[PDB]
């Protein structure tokens, strides 16, 4: 039996707590309006198991506890664990043991299973799963936590589902994630009764979920229906106003998240210029370039943090993820008056006749105290800093010319006497010094991000390519969401030339195969939302810009949708214009003042029952 | 704060190998990055090859791996290109772009570029 799911089944998605906000999440959901599965059951069973493919959504109005329960498992043949729940008198056990499942699902004493030898972990919670009064569960295994939830309701009178929001209160999460594929529901019988209830199924879509000050929610919106749906999801509110509107990729709803970042596996050098032996000199600073590698800066900070860690242009944290193509560490030792004059900007000793920082920086700069092991009796005097020239250094210079600095009229030819000095200095670390002079040794990492095929990446995983499908892609950083299909184009192109301010991205690139993959929308064209107001009636209609009301169906890809957007994106009432095709008016011969401006002058409204109704500008 | 004027290039035969440089008046940036745009009649614009500013590492293309070299030099700062084995992909105008390593992938200096037909 098919029947209607009137708005149920919004669960809560996390767990931090929220009030008086919208939060637009993009977990697994029941879409609003969909076909359920409403099984009978008579008395040994009227349907077979049921395909588990992302949740269940269960429902039951029978009373006496006849569905005692619920049965999960993947083949329940010898193969992985089942998830078996049973509701006792006051207690319930949620044993997650290797079961052989017959086909006599049967309670009333434990029939359902044959055998169990190896049994993984298993709960003894105390309150039961089960307690006319609709009992809605929604099961959904995310991987490492099966979320179960519930919400008893008091049912109406004569009927099987009401018509009222009802959020589901979460309960505890229960550590599974063996492979769960199919969905049966246990039964139980005095003497060997009829029973009935619903199941649906869950699919990845958007939910604005309102929590109110209590911290409760009292209405959501699915994001997938009309396009009054696709509305409320885009201005993040409730009360539409009387007024055109736009939308976003709401349609296609991408269901997978394509990451493909990495493309080699070893491990960078990092700990190769943090702790060398003998770090360069100020006049002389040993740069390494590194590439192809793994840009792991987890070991960074958890190397006994340092002082001073301060990340220039990118934030600090959450460096694993943004990938660069090329890593240059740059490592010296200064005094500790001037370890911030080494920054974008500063200007001082080391800042002016030594290692300067460019003016736009997108590396970091991190320094520690070394007066332990560059410190000696009479002071270290292998380091060295210029501070007698006349060139101010530009950017990522390096001058290691020892030649006696010229500061008199006649020649000094390397005597150093009166009005003549020489460029360097051999400051001493001494170990009773302040801490203006406490030797610190700093590292300097620049991150290079050319037009060229990225290299060093972060840990992300790997996952697979997916094309043909709408998918959310971040392949080397791009995140977009989009189609991908297979394209016939030579290069990659390279879009600089008006700067591509309000652009996209039209092609990208796998970083582990070379080939040029085309990002295509997954539904748009312009598609303008007309609403009356949500205070005024629930009737919208929809405009797209770019079409001659027959490329609409092919523009939009309406082949899987919801049934209640096929009434607005066909040859119902339809009407072209010089803007596009208007689907959900009927076009009026007569002449009114002006109204909401649909597109090339022409204005519309609502009224007369009451629809909506489309007319030229009556100048 | 000035461009950069381009020469070379001009009119070529299938099988040969041709010198592009690329001078520059008032620029002393020795860490702005040097790359070769090429822009062939059609469709739009690729990227043939750069130079990391950096240090000296070159960082060339697919199509180019094994018949392009880049060189610069900074006594009188010009960048030198020579290609090899231009079969039939050749025919472009190329351009001499410069742009900071640290940034957007937008360049920050548009040359006059030269046109190379390969016939």
């Known amino acids: 039996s098919y029947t209607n799911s009137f708005t149920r089944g919004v669960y809560y998605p996390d767990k931090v707590f929220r009030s008086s906000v919208l939060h637009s999440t993009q977990d697994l959901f029941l879409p609003f309006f969909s076909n359920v599965t409403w099984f009978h059951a008579i008395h040994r069973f009227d349907n077979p198991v049921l395909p588990f493919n992302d949740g269940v959504y269960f429902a039951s109005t029978e009373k006496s506890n006849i569905i005692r329960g619920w049965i999960f498992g993947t083949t329940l043949d010898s193969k992985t664990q089942s998830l078996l729940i049973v509701n006792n008198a006051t207690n319930v056990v949620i044993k997650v043991c290797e079961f052989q499942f017959c086909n006599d699902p049967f309670l009333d004493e434990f029939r359902v299973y044959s055998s169990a030898n190896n049994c993984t972990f298993e709960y003894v919670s105390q309150p039961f799963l089960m307690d006319k009064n609709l009992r809605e569960f929604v099961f959904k295994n995310i991987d490492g936590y099966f979320k179960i939830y519930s919400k008893h309701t008091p049912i109406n009178l004569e009927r099987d589902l009401p018509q009222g929001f009802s959020a589901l209160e979460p309960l505890v999460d229960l550590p599974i994630g063996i492979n769960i594929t199919r969905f049966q529901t246990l039964l139980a019988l005095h003497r060997s009764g009829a029973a009935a209830y619903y199941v649906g199924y869950l699919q990845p879509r958007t939910f604005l979920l309102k929590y109110n000050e209590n911290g409760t929610i009292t209405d959501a919106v699915d994001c997938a229906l009309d396009p009054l749906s696709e509305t409320k999801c885009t201005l993040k509110s409730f009360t539409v106003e009387k007024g055109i509107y736009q939308t976003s990729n709401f349609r296609v709803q991408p269901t997978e998240s394509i990451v493909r970042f990495p493309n080699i596996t070893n491990l960078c050098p990092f700990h190769e210029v943090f702790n060398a032996t003998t770090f360069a000199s100020v006049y002389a600073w040993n740069r390494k370039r590194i590439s192809n590698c793994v840009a792991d800066y987890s070991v960074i900070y958890n190397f006994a943090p340092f002082f001073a860690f301060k990340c220039y242009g990118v934030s600090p944290t959450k460096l694993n993820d943004l990938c660069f193509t090329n890593v240059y560490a740059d490592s010296f030792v200064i005094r500790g008056n001037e370890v911030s004059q080494i920054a974008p900007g500063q200007t001082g000793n080391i800042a002016d006749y030594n290692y300067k920082l460019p003016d736009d920086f997108t590396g970091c700069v991190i320094a520690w105290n070394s007066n332990k092991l560059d410190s000696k009796p009479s002071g270290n005097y292998n380091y060295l800093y210029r501070l007698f020239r006349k060139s101010k250094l530009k950017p990522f210079e390096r001058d290691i010319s020892t030649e006696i600095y010229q500061a008199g009229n006649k020649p000094c030819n390397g005597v150093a006497g009166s009005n003549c000095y020489s460029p360097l200095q051999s400051y001493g670390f001494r170990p009773t010094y302040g801490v203006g002079h406490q030797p610190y040794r700093v590292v300097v990492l620049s991150f290079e991000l050319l037009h060229a095929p990225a290299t060093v990446c972060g840990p992300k995983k790997s996952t697979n390519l997916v094309k043909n499908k709408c998918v959310n892609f971040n392949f080397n950083g791009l995140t977009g969401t989009g189609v991908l299909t297979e394209s016939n184009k030579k290069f990659l192109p390279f879009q600089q030339f008006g700067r591509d301010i309000a652009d996209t991205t039209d092609a990208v690139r796998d970083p582990q195969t070379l080939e040029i993959l085309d990002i295509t929308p997954c539904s748009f064209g312009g598609v303008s939302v007309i609403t009356p107001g949500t205070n005024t009636s629930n009737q919208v209609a929809v405009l797209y810009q770019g079409v001659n009301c027959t490329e609409v169906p092919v523009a939009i890809h309406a082949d899987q949708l919801t049934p209640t957007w096929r009434v607005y994106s066909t040859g119902s009432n339809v009407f072209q214009t010089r803007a596009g095709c208007l689907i959900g008016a009927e076009y009026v011969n007569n002449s009114y003042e002006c109204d909401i401006p649909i597109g090339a002058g022409i204005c519309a409204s609502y009224q007369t029952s009451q629809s909506i109704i489309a007319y030229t500008m009556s100048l | 704060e000035v461009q950069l004027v381009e020469s070379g290039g001009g009119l070529v035969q299938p099988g040969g190998s041709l010198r592009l440089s690329c001078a520059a008046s008032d620029f002393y940036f020795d860490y702005y990055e040097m790359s070769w745009v090429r822009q062939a009649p059609g469709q739009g614009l690729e990227w043939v090859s750069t130079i990391s500013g950096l240090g000296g590492a070159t960082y060339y293309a697919d199509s180019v791996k094994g018949r392009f070299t880049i060189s610069r030099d900074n006594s009188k700062n010009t960048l030198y290109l020579q290609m090899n084995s231009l079969r039939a992909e050749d025919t472009a105008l190329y351009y001499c772009?410069?742009?900071?390593?640290?940034?957007?992938?937008?360049?920050?200096?548009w040359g006059q570029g030269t046109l190379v037909t390969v016939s």
């Open positions: 772009a410069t742009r900071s390593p640290f940034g957007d992938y937008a360049f920050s200096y």
